[PDB]
Design a protein around this ligand. Sequence first.
Ligand SMILES: O=C(O)C1=C[C@H](O)[C@@H](OS(=O)(=O)O)[C@H](O[C@H]2[C@H](O)[C@@H](NS(=O)(=O)O)[C@@H](O[C@H]3[C@H](O)[C@@H](OS(=O)(=O)O)[C@H](O[C@H]4[C@H](O)[C@@H](NS(=O)(=O)O)[C@@H](O)O[C@@H]4COS(=O)(=O)O)O[C@H]3C(=O)O)O[C@@H]2COS(=O)(=O)O)O1
Ligand SMILES: *[C@@H]1O[C@H](CO[C@@H]2O[C@@H](C)[C@@H](O)[C@@H](O)[C@@H]2O)[C@@H](O[C@@H]2O[C@H](CO)[C@@H](O)[C@H](O)[C@H]2NC(C)=O)[C@H](O)[C@H]1NC(C)=O
Ligand SMILES: *[C@@H]1O[C@H](CO[C@@H]2O[C@@H](C)[C@@H](O)[C@@H](O)[C@@H]2O)[C@@H](O[C@@H]2O[C@H](CO)[C@@H](O)[C@H](O)[C@H]2NC(C)=O)[C@H](O)[C@H]1NC(C)=O
Lengths: 200, 200
Amino acid sequence: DEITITTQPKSGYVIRNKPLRLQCRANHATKIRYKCSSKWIDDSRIEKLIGTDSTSGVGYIDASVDISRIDVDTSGHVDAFQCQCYASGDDDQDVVASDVATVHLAYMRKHFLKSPVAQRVQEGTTLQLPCQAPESDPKAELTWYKDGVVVQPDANVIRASDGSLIMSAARLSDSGNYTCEATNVANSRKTDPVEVQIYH
Amino acid sequence: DEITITTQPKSGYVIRNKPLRLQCRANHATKIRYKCSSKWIDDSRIEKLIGTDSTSGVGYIDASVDISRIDVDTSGHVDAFQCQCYASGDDDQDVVASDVATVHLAYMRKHFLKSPVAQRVQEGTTLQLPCQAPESDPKAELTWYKDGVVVQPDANVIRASDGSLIMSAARLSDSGNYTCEATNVANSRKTDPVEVQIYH
Ligand SMILES: O=C(O)C1=C[C@H](O)[C@@H](OS(=O)(=O)O)[C@H](O[C@H]2[C@H](O)[C@@H](NS(=O)(=O)O)[C@@H](O[C@H]3[C@H](O)[C@@H](OS(=O)(=O)O)[C@H](O[C@H]4[C@H](O)[C@@H](NS(=O)(=O)O)[C@@H](O)O[C@@H]4COS(=O)(=O)O)O[C@H]3C(=O)O)O[C@@H]2COS(=O)(=O)O)O1
Ligand SMILES: *[C@@H]1O[C@H](CO[C@@H]2O[C@@H](C)[C@@H](O)[C@@H](O)[C@@H]2O)[C@@H](O[C@@H]2O[C@H](CO)[C@@H](O)[C@H](O)[C@H]2NC(C)=O)[C@H](O)[C@H]1NC(C)=O
Ligand SMILES: *[C@@H]1O[C@H](CO[C@@H]2O[C@@H](C)[C@@H](O)[C@@H](O)[C@@H]2O)[C@@H](O[C@@H]2O[C@H](CO)[C@@H](O)[C@H](O)[C@H]2NC(C)=O)[C@H](O)[C@H]1NC(C)=O
């Protein structure tokens, strides 16, 4: 009969030393191959699970491969590294190609594009503490910590869309050691603590 | 009132370069400290989240710490590393200690304690292919592959509890290149393919 793809391979990230696993499943197919950016993935790397659907009697083949950082780096198309699945069978059936799955190397650099700095400032002063994550993929999420406690926005302190922390009228209770943390699936990094003194 | 623990710190593994995060949550408490293998965790390392449930009006404190491979290795109790959290508060309230969480370093060695070997054997022979994972913590899980297809136990081939593959009466169709794969949270390893020839 006709070959169609049941599970489509999904884009995703290679994180640290953990390959990205693509899974691809096709009904009425006998062979699945993976081609990634003009190169063919060596068929010995493909882990196949073959059977017949008990309910409908329709055969299937479920193939998965681990795409590694070695693969992406040796491709020649690192910034457009993308993979596809090919379901063939009898001499009479048409090869059916899958969706394109893109594989990216997830990372987070070491240097914060914006980081706070120590301040000694008088009570009532509006103080703004900047923070912007290091260049990262996927995008990072910021959390702010005051002496180890996650800062909770209220009436005087607010988290601004640019990632900074704003205290409208600095209370004495706002003094402390502040740190910004950036997090994504690849790493989690904190600025060195800066000190904030509020006096009168 | 009364201090009680909502989230108990849970045992677990340090995997690769990923610390284990112990989390500990207490009602009506104001401070949580962590002690690990008799040593006290420096309170600047504790990520604390403080608030009031509002639904129940009952205050809480949710504290977390990342236990690293460096922590376990410099402890002096590498094979018995265990941690606890202590939720204090007012000078009037009793310190409440939590469950003991043990931290282990997850690993899996390089060579299999048992691996198959090539066989050329006559049809009808009972054939047994051994496999035992490399020494690993936590315990590893075995998968068998025939030329890349996951072996499905049936009537002639059966997965035995000792990890081996047993073919009661070797059929011609049982010839192929066989591989044993071991998996645990720390790594995944495959024996080199061996060939099994079944003749007449
Ligand atoms: O040029 C480089 O420096 C570099 C190049 C690589 O591109 C890079 O990959 S990336 O994915 O990170 O972008 C690579 O990072 C390595 C790093 O070099 C390793 N160092 S090593 O162990 O000496 O070899 C390593 O270390 C990190 C671990 O996540 C972790 O170690 S442990 O828990 O396994 O013992 C440790 O974690 C810190 C954590 O980062 C802290 N976060 S904070 O925001 O900074 O506060 C905090 O939670 O404490 C823990 C524990 O601290 S302790 O160890 O002092 O107790 O340290 C990390 C580190 O290196 O600083 O792994 C990364 C990732 O490698 S991977 O191959 O991609 O997996 O560096
Ligand atoms: C905020 O931080 C200051 C100083 O931080 C210290 O130095 C850093 C490099 C880091 O190693 C931190 O963990 C240190 O705490 C704190 O002032 C220190 O307080 C301790 C005891 O309270 C004292 O022994 C040190 O000498 C002090 N250091 C200095 C430079 O004065 C301060 O207590 C922290 N908390 C608040 C709310 O400001
Ligand atoms: C079992 O394997 C042999 C050899 O496996 C080859 O070497 C491995 C290291 C790995 O890279 C495999 O992918 C290789 O196939 C097979 O013998 C080969 O058969 C093909 C038939 O298409 C032939 O083109 C090769 O030249 C042969 N190579 C050698 C060294 O003999 C054998 O066919 C496999 N048996 C089964 C049932 O799959």
